[PDB]
UniProtKB/Swiss-Prot annotation, chain D:
Gene: DLST
Disease field: Pheochromocytoma/paraganglioma syndrome 7: A form of pheochromocytoma/paraganglioma syndrome, a tumor predisposition syndrome characterized by the development of neuroendocrine tumors, usually in adulthood. Pheochromocytomas are catecholamine-producing tumors that arise from chromaffin cells in the adrenal medulla. Paragangliomas develop from sympathetic paraganglia in the thorax, abdomen, and pelvis, as well as from parasympathetic paraganglia in the head and neck. PPGL7 tumors are generally benign, tend to be abdominal, and often secrete normetanephrine.
Natural source organism: Homo sapiens (Human)
Segment of the intact protein contained: 241 to 453 of 453
Function, as annotated: Dihydrolipoamide succinyltransferase (E2) component of the 2-oxoglutarate dehydrogenase complex. The 2-oxoglutarate dehydrogenase complex catalyzes the overall conversion of 2-oxoglutarate to succinyl-CoA and CO(2). The 2-oxoglutarate dehydrogenase complex is mainly active in the mitochondrion. A fraction of the 2-oxoglutarate dehydrogenase complex also localizes in the nucleus and is required for lysine succinylation of histones: associates with KAT2A on chromatin and provides succinyl-CoA to histone succinyltransferase KAT2A.
UniProt protein name: Dihydrolipoyllysine-residue succinyltransferase component of 2-oxoglutarate dehydrogenase complex, mitochondrial
Effect noted on mutating Y182C: In PPGL7; uncertain significance; not changed dihydrolipoyllysine-residue succinyltransferase activity
Assembly with partners or alone: The 2-oxoglutarate dehydrogenase complex is composed of OGDH (2-oxoglutarate dehydrogenase; E1), DLST (dihydrolipoamide succinyltransferase; E2), DLD (dihydrolipoamide dehydrogenase; E3) and the assembly factor KGD4. It contains multiple copies of the three enzymatic components (E1, E2 and E3). In the nucleus, the 2-oxoglutarate dehydrogenase complex associates with KAT2A. Interacts with ABHD11; this interaction maintains the functional lipoylation of the 2-oxoglutarate dehydrogenase complex.
Effect after changing H184A: Loss of dihydrolipoyllysine-residue succinyltransferase activity
Subcellular location: Mitochondrion matrix; Nucleus
Amino acid sequence: GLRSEHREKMNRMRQRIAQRLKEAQNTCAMLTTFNEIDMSNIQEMRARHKEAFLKKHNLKLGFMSAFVKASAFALQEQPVVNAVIDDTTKEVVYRDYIDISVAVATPRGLVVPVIRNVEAMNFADIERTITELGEKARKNELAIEDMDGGTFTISNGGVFGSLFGTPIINPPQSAILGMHGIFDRPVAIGGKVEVRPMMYVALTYDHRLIDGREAVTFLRKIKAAVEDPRVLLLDL
Amino acid sequence: GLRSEHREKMNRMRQRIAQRLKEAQNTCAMLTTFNEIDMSNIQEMRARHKEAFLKKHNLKLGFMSAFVKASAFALQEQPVVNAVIDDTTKEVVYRDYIDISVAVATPRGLVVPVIRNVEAMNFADIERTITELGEKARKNELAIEDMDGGTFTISNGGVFGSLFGTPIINPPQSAILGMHGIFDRPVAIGGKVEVRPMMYVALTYDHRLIDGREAVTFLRKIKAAVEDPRVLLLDL
Amino acid sequence: GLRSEHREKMNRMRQRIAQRLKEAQNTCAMLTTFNEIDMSNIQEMRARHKEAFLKKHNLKLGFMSAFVKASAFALQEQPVVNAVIDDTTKEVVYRDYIDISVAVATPRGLVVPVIRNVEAMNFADIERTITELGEKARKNELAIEDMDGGTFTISNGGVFGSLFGTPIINPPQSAILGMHGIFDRPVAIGGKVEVRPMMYVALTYDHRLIDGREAVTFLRKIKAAVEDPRVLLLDL
Amino acid sequence: AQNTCAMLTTFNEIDMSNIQEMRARHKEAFLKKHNLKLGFMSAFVKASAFALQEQPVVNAVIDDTTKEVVYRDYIDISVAVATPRGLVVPVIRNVEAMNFADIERTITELGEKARKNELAIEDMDGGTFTISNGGVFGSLFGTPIINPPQSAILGMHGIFDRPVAIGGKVEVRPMMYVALTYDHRLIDGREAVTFLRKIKAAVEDPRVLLLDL
C-alpha cells in the first residue's frame, strides 16, 4: 500500500530474546495439554480469610500462591517436569529442589523472577515473596540472579483475559504452566447445569522428557489441589 | 500391508509451498491464543439490515467484514501485529497502512487475496471487494499482485465447521486470525445459563515481535468490536 | 537452590526417541484442529450390546473401535491423510490400504502397535486385535514388525483424563488423532441446555500435505460416525 | 431567513433506548481512553453526515445574487451551544472526515471556548447544516429557525419516557421528537422526510453508520 513503512533497528537485548527463544523450539519438543479448574472453592477462601490474612501478614491474598504450592505438591511427586535435558551431554538433570520462576507483567514488557525453594515454604511466605518482587519489578532494580535459574514456570495471562492459549518455555526448564482467565462458564455438576467461575489451564512440556502420562497427571494434581486445597496437607 | 501404494511426483508449485511454509516456522516463534465471541448481536444485524444492504449496494451481507474492520480498529491501535521482522537486517518494519489478506477456499485448494488499505474503507466497500474477489477466484484469473503483500490475515475455517484450531502464518506477516464456526453453545450471562451462537477465534502470532499482552488484548478488541460493533465508531 | 541435582545418563533408545522425534517436527508442518463429540449414542451401545458382545465374542466392548472404524470410513474417502510425503524423493505416497497404529499406555511408558488392514475388518475383529495386543504389551514380547509401519494413528489420552491437547506425529505418518476424555459437559440441543458426555477430539496434521479443508472435514466424519454409528453402513 | 426561505417543518420521533445503553456501557471506556464525556449528540452529528452526504440538497443552498444552487461536497455542521449571554452557533468543520469521538473532542473544545467569550468569528462563520438541542431545557417539540446561510436545521426536543407500541403491545421507552425545518424552494418533502428517517434509523440503530446504508 502506502510506502510509509518506518523501521527501527533491533538493539541486541530485544533481538537476543528471539535468538535464545528459538533454542527453546528447535531444542524442546513443545506440546501442550489443557484442563479446566473450578475456582469457586478458592475464591471463597479469598472471601473469608482475606482480612484475617491482611491484619496478620499485611499481605494481599491471591489465587496464585495456590498454583505455586500445588505446582510443588505435584512437581515433587513427578520429578521429571522438575528435571531438564542437558544438551552438551545427553543426560537428564533431576533436582530435589524447586525454584519456581513466576512471570509478572510490566510496562517495559515482562520479567520472570524466581521463588527459590518453594518446597520449604508455606502458602503465605510465597505471597511475601511475590509482593517483594512485584514492588521490585516496578522500579527497575530486579537483579539477574533473582531471574537466573528456574525449574518450572507459571504465566498468568488471565489478568488480561485470555481464555486459553499455548505458552512457551523460557529455558532452561522443561515445562511452563499457564493460567487463562476466570470466566463464569456453565458447568455440569451431577447431571444438572450451573454457572461456576472457571479457568482453563495449560501445560506446555518437552516431550523428549515428558510422556503425556507424566503431564496430564501432573496437571490433574494442580487441578485437584485448587478445587480442594485441603489435598495439599494430605500430601496426596 | 498390501504393497499397492501408488505415488505421484510433486510438481514445483505444490512442493514450493512446503518450502516457503517451513520458513514460517523456523523463522517465526508461532504461538496461539484463543477466545470466544458471542455473535448474536451481529446476526441480528444480518437479520434486519440484510435487505436494505441488498436493495442499496446489491451486495450480500456477511459476518466477515466485521472481523476485517475490527481487525483494523485493533490493528491500528497495536501496530506491532501490523509489523514484521526483517531477516536480512534484524529490524522491525512498522506500517501505517494495513492491507489485510483474506483467505477464500476454492476447488483447486485455497488462495489468499488482499484487501488493500482497509483503514480508508467502510463496512460495505469491504464486501464490495470480497465479492469482487470471490468471483475472481472461481475463474482462475486471480493475479499475483492481488495476492502479493499482506500485513495481517484472516482465515475462515468455520464455513467447514471447525470448533477451534491452530492457524499458520503465510509470511511475510506477523500474525493471522482464524474464525472457527458458529455453534449454539451454552453461555452464562448474569449467573444464569443460556444458549448463544458463539465462535472460537484464534490468533497465531510471532512471539519474537509480540508479547502475549500485545495479542490477548488485540484479540479482545476483535472480541468487543464484534459483540458490540458500535465500538468501531467510538474509535475506542 | 540446593546443589543437590543428581543426573543420569541417557541410554540410546531413550534419547533415540528425541532424535527421531525432532525429524517429525522440522520435517512436518504440524498443526492441530479440534472438535467435540457427544458420545451418548455410543455409550448406550455399550449399555445394551455389552453382554451380547461378551457371551458371543468373549471380548470387552469399548468406545474405541468406533474411532478405529470411523477413522477408516473417513480415511478411505480422504486418502491424503492416509498418504505421506517422501523426503528422499519429493513425492507423495498414497495408499489403498490402511494399517492404523494404536497407542496403548504401559508401565515402561508407551508403545504404538498396529492394526493392519482395517478396511477389511469389522467392528469386533478390531477389539479381537486390541485385546490380543494389550495382553502382548503387558508382557514385553511385542515385536518390531507389529509396531513397524503405520499410515494413521490414534492416541487415547482420555483414560488419564485430559480435556484436550496437541498430539504429536510418530512418523512415518501424516496425521494422528487424539481422544481427550469423556466429561459430562453442558450442551445446547435445540436452543435449550443439557448435560451430555462429551469428548474433545484432536487431529494433528502435516500442512504440507493437508489443507485445512482436508482435515476439518476428515474430523467431522469421525464426529458423525461416532454420534451416529449407523453412518458407517451407509458408506456415506 | 424568512422572506428568503420557504420555511416548513417536519417531525418524527426517535426511540433513544439503544443509544443510552451505548452511554451506559462504553461511557467509562470512552473516558479512560479519550478523557471525553460521551453524549447522545455526536450521533445526531454523524447521522446528519450519513444522510447529508446521501441527500446533498439539504447540504446545498440557494444563492440570491444569482439564482443558482450551490452544492457542496463537504459538510461543516454548525452546532448550537446555549450560554449565559444567550446562544452561539459554532462550527464543526469537515465532519465527513471525522469519527464519533473527534466530534466530542471538538464540542468540548468549543463548550469551553463558549464559557469564556473568546469564540472567534471564523469558528462561527459558515455552515451548511445546523443542529439545535432545545431538549436540555425540556421542550417536547417545536419549530426551529434557519440561521442562514443554510438550507435546513435539525432540532432535538427532549427525552421523555413515553408509551410506545412495539409489536402490537404497549411499553415505555425514552423518546425524542425531532424536527427538520427546511427551505421548500430547494427541498421537496420527499427530500426531507427521508433525510429525517435516516437520522431516525442511524440513532435507533447506530450500526447503520458503518454499513454506509
